[PDB]
Structure formats: structure tokens, C-alpha cells
Ligand binder design. Structure first.
Ligand SMILES: Cc1ccc(C(=O)N(CCCN)[C@@H](c2oc3cc(Cl)ccc3c(=O)c2Cc2ccccc2)C(C)C)cc1
Ligand SMILES: Nc1ncnc2c1ncn2[C@@H]1O[C@H](COP(=O)(O)OP(=O)(O)O)[C@@H](O)[C@H]1O
Ligand SMILES: [Cl-]
Ligand SMILES: [Cl-]
Ligand SMILES: [Cl-]
Ligand SMILES: [Cl-]
Ligand SMILES: [Co+2]
Length: 349
């Protein structure tokens, strides 16, 4: 089913990897939607595995390419009144956060909205304001940013929370698929430029969080949500009301998720964070295969996203990998995970 998409983004070789003279073991064919990884020893050319996805982005792919292929078709649905999710999944250091958030280009050269290094979040907020303005619709934008760490929920947008008070999740009595997270702060964004300070405060609150908690931000899931209340009036009479929602999910690093058949796999995958990643896999698979049992309850992440994941929706996963020999096992495990989420057969060579 086309409503759930799985894509892979390979990042360029970094400086660490080039100074270790790491080998480049990954090949991405965009046209064939294939990613092939040399799986064997230093000299073994013959030995390679191939996987097929909805899309594949090689190392020269820029932020804009990712946004237009993956994001923009989804944003169209959100603005049409739906509730949609995009995940970034992958080993620590592979670009989950670069993809979701992005970076500032050097010197002064860009307004934040025009910076080509922008990731999904800034691009999305920019487009919501620009597009709804051009359409003449009346709208408002609200945002919240929830972090998940050791099963505890944290609001990163609460200035006065300060800091590490945990929120409380309840089933929503008025929504069978919904939860209410008690005291989660949804900030209203009156003017597009305000997101910058809101999120800059979020980052400082996030930096603080790292100073007390163990391996924070590699082990945490971050859920950014934008809700848009929109009102249009048609040519003849009608006032029209729609609520769209977009979840942008930067997942805990996948480094301890094993490939199948791995020696120590159970031991490595122990702990709440690793199991939440696996639970998510199960939910996605069950949604793709359309099996009746989809286990949303077995993690906090999937309880929070159930409402989005289970409706008339678009859901994409961006699986980020390193090109390097330093990363081989983690890259293969990421591809296996992505492949298990949505099973796409290799086309004939
Ligand atoms: C053009 C640009 C791109 C990235 C940044 C940046 O480095 N940020 C900090 C986080 C980098 N991983 C931005 C940023 O911070 C976030 C903090 C949290 Cl807690 C969650 C998401 C973001 C995020 O998406 C961004 C990127 C951004 C968002 C809105 C406007 C401009 C940039 C600024 C708002 C400081 C600043 C400017
Ligand atoms: N597509 C990319 N192009 C260039 N640099 C990238 C890319 N993806 C990640 N990086 C860089 O690699 C480092 C780690 O990326 P990050 O997004 O923090 O990974 P993760 O969030 O998956 O741990 C950062 O310095 C980031 O700037
Ligand atoms: Cl090697
Ligand atoms: Cl469009
Ligand atoms: Cl199960
Ligand atoms: Cl189970
Ligand atoms: Co490539």
C-alpha cells in the first residue's frame, strides 16, 4: 500500500571516516530504488546485498530533494485535513537530526527559511505559513515537542517547567485511538518567525536535559507536532473547517537493534528504548500487511502516535545510513528493519 512509504537516505562520508580511511561499502541506485551494500571481506567484490525501497537518496542528495519527494506530498494531505507522520530511523550519527532539523549555513548568508541546509521541520513551518497565506485561508498553527526517554515523557517547549518534571499520559475518553498528555504545552505560533525562538528555547531546554540523563538525545525519541486549524470560504457561500496535523519523529538511535541471526542480539536489544523501536516496527508491518493485531499499547511512542498511524493517513519512514565500513553491521540492520517494515521485493537484475 502506497500510503505508507519507506525510503533510505545515505549521508556522505564524514571527516572521521575519511581519516580512518574507511571504505565506501554502500551503493544507492535512485532510478532502481535500490541500495546495495558490499557485505564481505576487504577483497570480496562478489559479496553484496541488495534492498529495494519506495525511494533511495544517495550521498549527494540535498535537503530540498528530500523535502520535495518525501514531505511535500504529505504536507498536501495535512493541509487537506489529515493527520500524518514522518519518522527518521537509523544509527546514531547517520543523520536523523540533520534530516528533521538541519543546520545553519556559515557566515550570515541566509534567512533561516531560505537556508539550503534546513531540514524537514523549518521547511514545513515555512511552507505552512507561505501556502495558507497564498490560498487566503484563515488558519492558526500550534506546536509541541515531546521527548521520550527511559519511558518518561518530557515537554521541551515549557519555559517554566524547568526542567525534568515528567508528564502523565492517559487514554482519551473521547477518542478510542487517542491519548491526552497532561500538561503538554502546545505553543501557538502567531507569526512564522516565532518558531525560531520557540525552537531555540527548545534546544536549550534539550541541552540541559543532556547534562542530566545518560546518553540523552541518542537514546531519546523526539516528537514534534504541528496542528493547523484552517478555515476557508468558497466562491458561493460556504465556510469550510479542516484540522490537519503533522508529526515529525526523530527516533532514538538504532545501533543496538540487531540484524537477524546476530550472535548476542537479545542481550544487545534489551531495554525500553530498543524495544520501543521494535514495537514501532511491528505496528508498521501490521499496518502494511493489514493484520488485525497492531500493538500500539506496547510502547509510549506508538500509544502517542496511534491516532495518526491508524486513520486515513500518510506515513513515511526515512531510514538513514552511513556509507562507511565502520558502520557495516548497523547499516545492514537498518536496511533489514526498513525492509521488514514494508516488504518490497527486489526487481530482476
Ligand atoms: C537555518 C538553521 C537551521 C538549523 C538551526 C539549528 O541549528 N537549530 C538548532 C538545532 C540543530 N539540530 C534550530 C532548530 O532547533 C530545533 C530545536 C529543537 Cl528542540 C527541535 C527542532 C529544532 C529545529 O528543527 C531547528 C531548525 C529550525 C527550525 C525553525 C526555524 C529555523 C531552524 C534553531 C531554531 C536554533 C538554525 C538555523
Ligand atoms: N546528508 C548529510 N549531509 C551532510 N552531513 C550530514 C548529513 N547527515 C548527517 N550529517 C552530519 O553528520 C553528523 C551526525 O548527524 P546527525 O543528524 O546528528 O545524526 P543522528 O541524528 O542520526 O545521530 C552531523 O555532524 C551532521 O552534520
Ligand atoms: Cl574492512
Ligand atoms: Cl504542491
Ligand atoms: Cl506483538
Ligand atoms: Cl508481545
Ligand atoms: Co551513494
Amino acid at each position: 500500500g502506497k500510503n505508507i512509504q519507506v525510503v533510505v537516505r545515505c549521508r556522505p562520508f564524514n571527516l572521521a571516516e575519511r581519516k580512518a580511511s574507511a571504505h565506501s561499502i554502500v551503493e544507492c541506485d535512485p532510478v532502481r530504488k535500490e541500495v546495495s551494500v558490499r557485505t564481505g571481506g576487504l577483497a570480496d567484490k562478489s559479496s553484496r546485498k541488495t534492498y529495494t525501497f519506495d525511494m533511495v537518496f544517495g550521498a549527494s542528495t540535498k535537503q530540498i530533494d528530500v523535502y520535495r519527494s518525501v514531505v511535500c506530498p504529505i504536507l498536501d494531505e495535512v493541509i487537506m485535513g489529515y493527520n500524518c507522520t514522518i519518522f527518521a530511523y537509523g544509527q546514531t550519527g547517520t543523520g536523523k537530526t540533520f534530516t528533521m532539523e538541519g543546520e545553519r549555513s556559515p557566515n550570515e548568508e541566509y534567512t533561516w527559511e531560505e537556508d539550503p541546509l534546513d531540514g524537514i521541520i523549518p521547511r514545513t513551518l515555512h511552507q505552512i505559513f507561505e501556502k495558507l497565506t497564498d490560498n487566503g485561508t484563515e488558519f492558526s498553527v500550534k506546536v509541541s515537542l515531546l521527548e521520550i526517554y527511559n519511558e518518561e515523557l518530557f515537554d521541551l517547549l515549557n519555559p517554566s517547567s524547568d526542567v525534568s518534571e515528567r508528564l502523565q499520559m492517559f487514554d482519551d475518553p473521547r477518542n478510542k485511538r487517542g491519548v491526552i498528555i497532561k500538561g503538554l504545552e502546545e505553543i501557538t505560533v502567531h507569526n512564522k518567525d516565532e518558531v525560531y525562538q520557540i525552537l531555540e528555547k527548545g534546544a536549550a531546554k534539550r541541552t540541559t536535559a543532556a547534562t542530566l540523563m545518560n546518553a540523552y538525545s541518542s537514546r531519546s525519541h523526539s516528537v514534534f507536532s504541528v496542528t493547523i486549524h484552517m478555515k476557508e470560504t468558497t466562491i458561493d457561500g460556504e465556510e469550510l473547517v479542516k484540522i490537519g496535523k503533522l508529526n515529525l519523529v526523530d527516533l532514538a538511535g538504532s545501533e543496538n537493534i540487531g540484524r537477524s541471526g546476530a550472535v548476542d542480539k537479545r542481550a544487545r536489544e534489551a531495554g525500553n528504548i530498543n524495544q520501543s523501536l521494535l514495537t514501532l516496527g511491528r505496528v508498521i508491518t501490521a499496518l502494511v500487511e493489514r493484520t488485525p493485531h497492531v500493538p500500539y499499547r506496547e510502547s509510549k511512542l506508538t500509544r502517542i502516535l496511534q491516532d495518526s498511524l491508524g486513520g486515513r493517513t500518510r506515513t513515511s519512514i526515512i531510514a538513514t545510513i552511513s556509507p562507511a565500513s565502520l558502520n557495516l553491521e548497523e547499516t545492514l540492520s537498518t536496511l533489514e528493519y526498513a525492509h521488514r517494515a514494508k516488504n518490497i521485493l527486489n526487481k530482476p537484475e
